[PDB]
Amino acid sequence: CFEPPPAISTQTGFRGLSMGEVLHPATVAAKKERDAQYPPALPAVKAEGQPVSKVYKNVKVLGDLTEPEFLRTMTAMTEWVSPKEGCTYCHDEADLSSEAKYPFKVARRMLEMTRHINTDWTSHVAQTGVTCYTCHRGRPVPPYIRYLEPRLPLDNAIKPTFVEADNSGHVVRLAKNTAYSALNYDPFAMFLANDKREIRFVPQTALPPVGVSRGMERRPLSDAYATFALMMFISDAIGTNCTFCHNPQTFESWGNKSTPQRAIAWQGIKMTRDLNMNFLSPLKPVYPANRLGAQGEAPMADCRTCHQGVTKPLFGASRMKDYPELGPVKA
Amino acid sequence: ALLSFERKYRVRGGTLIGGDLFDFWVGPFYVGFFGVSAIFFIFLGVSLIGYAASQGPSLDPFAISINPPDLKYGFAGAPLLEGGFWQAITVCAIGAFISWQLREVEISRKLGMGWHVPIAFGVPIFMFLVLQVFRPILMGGWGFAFPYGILSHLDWVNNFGFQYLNWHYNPGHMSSVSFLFANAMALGLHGGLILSVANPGDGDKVKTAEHENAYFRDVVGYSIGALAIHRLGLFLASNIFLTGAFGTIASGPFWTRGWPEWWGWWLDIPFWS
Amino acid sequence: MYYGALANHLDIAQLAWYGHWLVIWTVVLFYLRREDRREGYPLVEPLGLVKLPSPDVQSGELPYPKTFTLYHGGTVQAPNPNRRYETRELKLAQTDGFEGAPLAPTGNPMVDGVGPASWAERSEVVDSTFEGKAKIVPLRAAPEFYIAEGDLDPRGLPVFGADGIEAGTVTDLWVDRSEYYFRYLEISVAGSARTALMPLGFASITKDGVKVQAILASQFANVPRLQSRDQITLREEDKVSAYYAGGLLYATPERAEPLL
Amino acid sequence: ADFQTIYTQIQARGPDHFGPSGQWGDIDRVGKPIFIKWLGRIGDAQIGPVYLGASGVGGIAFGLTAILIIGFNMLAQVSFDPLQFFRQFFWLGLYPPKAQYGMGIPPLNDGGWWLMAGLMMTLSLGCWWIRVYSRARALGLGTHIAWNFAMAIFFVLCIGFFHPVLVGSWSEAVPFGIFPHLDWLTAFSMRYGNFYYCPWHGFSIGFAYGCGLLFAAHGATILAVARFGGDREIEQITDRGTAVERAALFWRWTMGFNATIESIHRWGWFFSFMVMFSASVGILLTGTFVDNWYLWCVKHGAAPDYPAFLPATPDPRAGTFDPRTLTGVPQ
Amino acid sequence: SASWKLWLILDPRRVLTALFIYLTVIALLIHFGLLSTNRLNWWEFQRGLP
Amino acid sequence: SASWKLWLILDPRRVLTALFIYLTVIALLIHFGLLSTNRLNWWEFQRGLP
Amino acid sequence: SLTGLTEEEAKEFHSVFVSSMVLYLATAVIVHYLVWTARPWIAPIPKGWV
Amino acid sequence: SLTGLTEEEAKEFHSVFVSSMVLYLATAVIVHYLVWTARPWIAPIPKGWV
Ligand code: BCB
Ligand SMILES: C/C=C1/c2cc3[nH]c4c(c3C)C(=O)[C@H](C(=O)OC)c4c3nc(cc4[nH]c(cc(n2)[C@@H]1C)c(C(C)=O)c4C)[C@@H](C)[C@@H]3CCC(=O)OC/C=C(\C)CCC[C@H](C)CCC[C@H](C)CCCC(C)C
Ligand SMILES: C/C=C1/c2cc3[nH]c4c(c3C)C(=O)[C@H](C(=O)OC)c4c3nc(cc4[nH]c(cc(n2)[C@@H]1C)c(C(C)=O)c4C)[C@@H](C)[C@@H]3CCC(=O)OC/C=C(\C)CCC[C@H](C)CCC[C@H](C)CCCC(C)C
Ligand SMILES: COC1=C(OC)C(=O)C(C/C=C(\C)CC/C=C(\C)CC/C=C(\C)CC/C=C(\C)CC/C=C(\C)CC/C=C(\C)CC/C=C(\C)CCC=C(C)C)=C(C)C1=O
Ligand SMILES: CC(C)=CCC/C(C)=C/CC/C(C)=C/CC/C(C)=C/CC/C(C)=C/CC/C(C)=C/CC/C(C)=C/CC1=C(C)C(=O)c2ccccc2C1=O
Ligand code: HEC
Ligand SMILES: CC(C)=CCC/C(C)=C/C=C/C(C)=C/C=C/C(C)=C/C=C\C=C(C)\C=C\C=C(/C)CC/C=C(\C)CCCC(C)C
Ligand SMILES: [Fe+3]
Ligand SMILES: [Mg+2]
């Protein structure tokens, strides 16, 4: 209810438009300390030998590597996903080729997903890229996952209170997933699980056009509310405000009225929809029943899953050069 | 040039500074030392606005915008076309407002009136100072202040509001808006009641203060009274800015998050989760 | 193609904008300012250079007079032809030849009734209740009115002037019977057989006594006198209030001087 | 300082008297007046008697019915949990339809209850307007208050009923709720492109600020001449004393012109009326004849433009979607 | 045994009105609190168990 | 004991009303706070146990 | 007295008030037993509850 | 008397007030024992607790 001064302010718009970031230094420092737990890159190994899909029996994604580099990748993955459990989280103790454990199959699809992100979505992740740690932060279950219904607490490792899991908490579950606003919508299920809905709702002409402006030919105003809820969610998930990407003088305008971060955010929306539709949701049959949602759906990812309240995940920390096997993949 | 009852009131004395030097009228206007300074600042500031507008991109009256400096300049004087003109006009505006208030003090001293009007005028001056000086000082530069333009200062208000993701949830804003609406409604009621009593209809008699009390005791069960309604109107009008200033000064210096999250103090009480 | 279009570059909102301005300025200039001119107009130029229209004709800026029919009696007009001319021979002399030049009192402005001590030529009638009784009366003449329980009773308190010298004793309160509101303190002034009314607004009242910044103790003697003991006319109210108000500027010479 | 202008130190008490008789309804003036002491410091101490009347009862009955509907639907929103109702009250709301039904009566679960509550509130406001008007008439007073009130009620109808009619959709109307109706403010402004660029929004705000200025100035003026009996405004209207001569001269010497003690009340009435009148005109123009106020201002040359501070970024979706899908249903 | 003297000072009407309102508030709280559960809700189809 | 003289100064009606409101608020806090916990909610099906 | 009741009015009101209060509480007791037969609302301690 | 009661009224009220308060507290004690038999709410110190 009180944050002591000073604040940190950036300027993202023309002078006098009060556009830019506003940050609490203690919050920034706490997030920086949290994100600095990123394990250092493992020492490089000599890339010499015959390819691993000659020595090994069940390699389907990382076949091009050699035994030292492949083992280094496995060591990085166990640091990033299951440091407490170790190799046994995904592997049979005796048969390293066995794919009996569901985390093995999930992790294979996750390797493909990470390579896809680092190869085909450089329009969003640029040369920073992602690794398993970007979402997992050293846990089997990433701290911020999404279902078709909002949940509390946001970090799923924390056990929910009675109200957070009860029907009477529904409104709060909405509010705390849209930065405490009263907007009566779940923008993740509407906009980020798939690409069925149009986020944009603002007209692009001064006067109402014939054919779209009366009665049943109009989109309901609920769409405006829903997009506002999505934008609140994005601002909270990225740890910024609307002027990071907009000149609120005209939210609908581009050019001098939007920042480059808005174009990157559009690429992020496309990438999140793609990841949910093509990699995370189709994993439903592999999971046990305790990982699925109320509708029996598989857990998904949103902006918060990678960003976790920072405009750049881990403040732009990168491992792309250190682990080329995670992307970009040269065809 | 005089109201028919005016001459007996035009006596010397009551000035704060200047004495008989500027103690005179020009037409209906009282001048005084602070009338002289008000005209100085008004002429200078409007002329600087005119020249600075002439050098901007559009001369359409509603598109003119004189903006403060970039944040990088901090509190330093900026080049005139890049915020320096805004700084000069800001100084002229402050001088004009304070001169006007002090001339009101002199006029009310001359008339044997209470100083309620210049004191009330102090409130919007204080809000202007909060917006353009005090909050910029806390935030660390003149670049946080609003620009001068019919529609551009609205852009500043808009973007300032959305820097905190929904300004409607600002508690100081909620109080300020409640006072604004209450004041407009109370002014409507008060004007209507006085006019209804003085203008009953066709050939009907002017009614009395007892009729004023009776009307509102009938309608809502309470009548605040003739003097008390003026006290209340002043109270509500003043509290618009007096309580808004808290939300304004808090936004950034005391609160960097979205305003809806501030209500977590209530929502997140552990007793009810 | 579009709703609201009247031409290629003419739309309904554009015309309604100018219509709104027309509404605002017609109401302001054609009606509200004319209403504003129902007192003090036509304007007078005692030191003018040119000939104005006679004050007794409807000269063009003047609204046509309206008639207020009073609750207890006759009628008044606005503009009021009877209040048009003021005839009192104010004790004031010009400090300079032009109208914009302030006037200076020729001696004892508070008694004369000039400047902040000026009183208006109100009707010499007692303001009344809607039942026809005198509205403002001392508590001795209105036993059915009383101070609310637990509130400070000021009767018997000493009254001190602006110079800290004791000036008198509160003898009574005067209550407004229509509004149920105390409006005056009656003060027996020391050094005479005489009572002076004072508006309750000029009194700072404690349990120790009442203090009056407005006038010196010795000036309480010259407060304007009520013709009747237990009632007050509207003009008497104006005179009594204006005496203390004039003291705000005239009680001592220093009060009329600037800081710098 | 005149401390009487701050509060009332010595309160007066008198006989329990019936007010001025009305042409009818003196039988319905009920209640024994009560005198609460702290209220007499800032205003009049007396509460009551209150007039019942037929129109007052109608206002109460319709208003209580609407309140009951709203509160019950809020309670259902927390699944009837009383503690959670108390906690979440500000975030709760009864919403108009979220789907597009045009102007058809929506189902109970998606806007029917909202519609019934809106009708009940409208009828309660109608009855209370009758009460205001007819009490003015009964006491032999002009009906100025009732016409100011009528303008306010008309604005309420514009935002709740008339604009939905004009664009043809109940989904545009204001929800009932503490935070939800503010959410509507923002969603409505976004849908129609920044209400800051609506000229009648500007007029309404100009007159609202003008009400602030005028009531501050007039209240302070009357307080400043309170020692001359300035608060007795009716007598000053009929027999002008030195209080209003001083008030007029203060304003004349300050700004070159002045009102009278009667006409300043006409100014106040006009400004308060114009708040609601300008707001009503703006709402009736919005959507029906103007789609995007910012683009309307750009078309008419009024909108300021600013250089980009960060690089200007073109719309990355330019020419990839049909612009009719922004505000119109695709099918 | 002198409990009846309570009505010499406590105004039976006030106590009756207060009890009416108070017991009503308690009853509404209990009925609506039970309806907010799955286990003890008797209006709706049974939820919270397979 | 002269404790009864308390009622010569303390106005039994005020004390009774204050106790009524005070104990009601405490009881409501306790009942509804217990119902906000997995462990001690006696209305709902048992939650929060493995 | 401060309420306007006489001595005998106070006694008669006290008698009827107490009888009504006792009857209301007794029917509440019976109703709670019947509701228990409908829903035994205080379940026994479940297995892993500590 | 600052509260309008006579001295014997004060003593009668005091006796009834103290008896009622004590009865209320005693039944609270019994009820808390019964509730403990239903739910022993102060759990023993858990294994890792310090
Ligand atoms: C998206 C952003 C929003 C926003 C952003 C916002 C901000 C950032 C602030 C407010 C503030 C305020 N807002 Mg909010 N706003 C309000 C209303 C209000 C006001 C009650 C309040 C105070 C305004 C103020 O300080 O002016 C200031 C006016 C001044 C200083 C006048 C100075 C006058 C000067 C002394 C004299 C000038 C004289 C002329 C130059 C002379 C002219 C000469 C003549 C002759 C021509 C309503 C009723 C709504 C509705 C309906 O939703 C709303 C929505 C919003 N506001 C949007 C949600 N607004 C302020 C506040 O208090 O917030 C808590 C504030 O800081
Ligand atoms: C809570 C109490 C409030 C309140 C109270 C009172 N209000 C008063 C008084 C009281 C008591 C007076 O006594 C005084 C007066 O005489 O009344 C007739 C006055 C007055 N209130 C004015 C404007 C007003 N009140 C607003 C708000 C409230 N008022 C709130 C609601 C607003 C809003 C909200 O926008 C406005 C615009 C003037 C008309 C007048 C000052 C004249 C002046 O100061 O003369 C001196 C100065 C000038 C005439 C011009 C100066 C021009 C400079 C040099 C150049 C321009 C600089 C500027 C920064 C550019 C801005 C651009 C823009 C697009 C962004
Ligand atoms: C520009 C001019 C404006 C303006 C003007 C004017 N405004 C007027 C008049 C004029 C001229 C009148 O003459 C009339 C009146 O009489 O004045 C005394 C009135 C009025 N403006 C009110 C409210 C108002 N004005 C607002 C705004 C503006 N006004 C703008 C600013 C706002 C804002 C902004 O939010 C509000 C809330 C009422 C007090 C009153 C109508 C009462 C009614 O129509 O009653 C209708 C009756 C009912 C709804 C029944 C109520 C039953 C109980 C008490 C309620 C439920 C209790 C239950 C226990 C449940 C609990 C929960 C529940 C509390 C939730
Ligand atoms: C166009 O200008 C106008 C406005 O500006 C927009 C208005 O705001 C208003 C007021 C408010 C509105 C238009 C908005 C709400 C109005 C609606 C929905 C339509 C009008 C409805 C009303 C004014 C009130 C609605 C009330 C009902 C339908 C219930 C009617 C029942 C009543 C009156 C009591 C039943 C009793 C009888 C039928 C006979 C006995 C009656 C009495 C003894 C007293 C009745 C007294 C009077 C004065 C009619 C008016 C009237 C107006 O003309
Ligand atoms: C030689 C030399 C230096 C000369 C200089 C002379 C000098 C200082 C000139 C100044 C010239 C300037 C700057 C003039 C500008 C004047 C200004 C600020 C005009 C603005 C007018 C505006 C827009 C006011 C907004 C408020 C408004 C709508 C007011 C209209 C209603 C009125 C007149 C309110 C004032 C008013 C109020 C508030 C009462 O309560 C009252 C009670 C009883 C009788 C009369 C009145 C009364 O007149
Ligand atoms: C889950 C996150 C894993 C952890 C932790 C570890 N490994 Fe793994 N491993 C995983 C997958 C999904 C795969 C299949 C790779 C593919 O592209 O198909 C593997 C593969 C291996 C293999 C090859 C098995 C074979 O066919 O011979 C080996 C030898 C291997 N992994 C070793 C290994 C070690 C030593 C680990 C601990 C440090 C380890 N893995 C962790 C998924 C996961
Ligand atoms: C043409 C046809 C067929 C029909 C037309 C019907 C018609 C005229 C409809 C009109 C609708 C209108 C005008 C709607 C307008 C709505 C508007 C402007 C609403 C705006 C704001 C509302 C707000 C802020 C409401 C807040 C409400 C509350 C907080 C209520 C709280 C209630 C309670 C605590 C009561 C609890 C009761 C308990 C038993 C549970
Ligand atoms: Fe008034
Ligand atoms: Mg539940």
Indicate the SS3 state at residue D32: coil
Length of chain D: 331
Beta-strand ranges (E) seen in chain B are 25-26, 29-30
B231 vs D88, D223, D305: nearest CB: D223
C28: DSSP letter: I
Name the residue among D260, D48, D40, D1 with its Cα closest to residue B227: D40
**Best residue in A202, A242, A270, A271 to probe D by mutation, most D CBs within 10 Å?**
A202
E32 touches chain D (CB under 8 A): yes
Phi-psi region of C164 (alpha: psi -120 to 50; beta: other; left: phi over 0): left
Phi, psi of D290 (to 5 degrees): -135, 130
B251 annotated as ligand-binding: no
Q: Give the D:E interface size as CB pairs under 8 Å.
A: 17
Instruction: Tell which one of D147, D149, D204, D276 to mutate to probe ligand 3, the residue whose CB is within 8 A of the most ligand atoms.
Output: D149
Residue to mutate (ligand 1; options B89, B123, B129, B176; most atoms within 8 A of CB)? B176
d(CA C239, CA D182): 54
Rounded CA separation C234/B5 (Å): 17
Q: Which residues does chain F have within 8 Å of residue E38's beta carbon, measured at their own beta carbons?
A: 44-45
Which residue in D261, D6, D44 sits closest to B234, CA to CA?
D6
Contacts of G3 in chain E (CB under 8 A): 7-12
Return all residues near A170 (Cβ < 8 A) that are at least 6 apart: D77, D78, D79
Helices (H), chain A: 25-35, 52-55, 67-80, 102-120, 122-125, 132-136, 162-165, 170-175, 187, 222-238, 260-275, 303-307
- Three-state SS at C201: helix
Concatenate the DSSP letters of all residues of D179-218 into one string: HHHHHHHHHHHHHTT-GGG-HHHHHHHHHHHHHHHHHHHH
Q: From the CA of A75, which ligand is nearest?
A: 6
Strands (E), chain C: 66-69, 75-78, 92-94, 103-105, 136-138, 146-147, 158-160, 166-176, 181-189, 195-199, 204-205, 210-211
Residue at token pair 């006696």: F42
C93, β-bridge pairs? C104
- CA–centroid distance, residue D285 to ligand 7 (Å): 24
Best CA proximity match to A190, nearest among A144, A155, A242, A225: A225
Nearest chain G Cα distance for residue H43, angstroms? 6
The answer to whether F46 touches G49, Cβ cutoff 8 Å, is yes
- Other CB atoms within 10 A of residue F3 CB: 11
Residue C238 contacts residue D228 (beta carbons within 8 Å): yes
Token pair listed for A268: 């992020």
Helix H or strand E encompassing D154: helix D144-157
Q: Say whether A51 sits in a helix, a strand or coil.
A: strand
Question: Tokens in use for B150?
Answer: 């019919």
Q: Is D261 left (phi over 0), alpha (psi -120 to 50) or beta?
A: alpha
Separation of first and last alpha carbons in chain B: 72
Give the containing element (helix H, strand E) for C97: none
**Nearest Cα to E21, choosing from F24, G27, F19, D87?**
F24
- List the one residue out of B34, B193, B178 whose CA is nearest residue B106: B34
CB B221 within 8 A of CB B260: no
Q: State how far the Cα of C179 lies from the Cα of D232, in Å rounded to an integer.
A: 10
3-class secondary structure, C186: strand
State whether the beta carbon of B22 lies less than 6 angstroms from ligand 1. no
**Is E1 annotated as ligand-binding?**
no
CB D234 within 8 A of CB B200: no
Inter-chain touch G10–E4, beta carbons under 8 Å: yes
- SS3 letters for D248-302? HHHHHHHHCCCCCCCHHHHHHHHHHHHHHHHHHHHHHHECCCECCHHHHHHHCCC
Q: Which residues contact D63 (CB under 8 A, 6 or more apart)?
A: D120, D121, D124, D128
C-beta atoms surrounding A280 within 10 Å? 24
β-pair type (D29-30, D50-51): antiparallel
Radius of gyration of chain D (CA): 25
Between β-strands C158-160 and C210-211, what pairing exists: parallel, antiparallel or unpaired?
A: parallel
Is B224 known to sit in a ligand binding site?
A: yes
Q: What is the DSSP letter of A209?
A: B
Nearest Cα neighbor of F43 from B189, G12, D262, G35 is G35
Best to test chain D binding among C1, C15, C20, C77 (most D CBs inside 10 Å): C20
CA pair distance A22, A8, nearest whole angstrom: 6
Q: How many CB atoms lie within 10 A of CB D243?
A: 30
Question: How far is the alpha carbon of D293 from chain B, nearest alpha carbon, in Å?
Answer: 12
Closest to D238 measured CA to CA, from C142, C123, C98: C123
Q: Cβ distance D135 to B193 under 8 Å?
A: no
The helix (run of H) or strand (run of E) holding residue D232 is: none
Pocket test for ligand 5, best of D251, D257, D274 (most atoms within 8 A of CB): D251
Buried b (16+ CB within 10 A) or exposed e, A133-156: bbbbbbbbebbbbbbbbbbbebeb
Q: Which of C99, E39, D291, F27 is nearest to G38 (CA)?
A: E39
- How far from A15 is each of C11, C166, C218, CA to CA, in Å? 33, 64, 64
Percent helix, percent strand, percent coil in chain H, to nearest 5 = 65, 0, 35
Q: Are C118 and C153 in contact (CB under 8 A)?
A: no
Cβ separation of A159 and F36 shorter than 8 Å? no
Alpha-carbon span B206 to D235, nearest angstrom: 10
Using CA coordinates, name the residue in chain F closest to D81.
F32
Tokens of H24: 């209320």
What separation in angstroms does the CA of D200 have from each of A146, C16, C17?
Answer: 43, 9, 8
E-assigned strand segments in C114-165: 136-138, 146-147, 158-160
The residue in chain G having the minimum alpha-carbon distance to the alpha carbon of residue F49 is G48
Q: What share of chain B is helix, strand, coil (3-state, %, to 5)?
A: 65, 5, 30
d(CA D243, CA C245): 11
Orientation of helix B84-110 relative to helix C234-250, angle to 10°: 120
Closest residue by Cα to residue A171 from F45, F34, D181, D74: D74
Tokens for F2, please give them. 């002269």
- Gap from C216 CA to chain B (nearest CA, Å): 16
Say how far apart CA F18 and CA B208 lie, in whole Å. Answer: 45
Which residue is associated with the tokens 């030049």? C101
**For residues A298 and F12, what is the distance between their CA atoms, to the nearest angstrom?**
64
- The approach used to solve this structure was cryo-EM
Tell me whether E12 touches chain G (CB under 8 Å).
yes
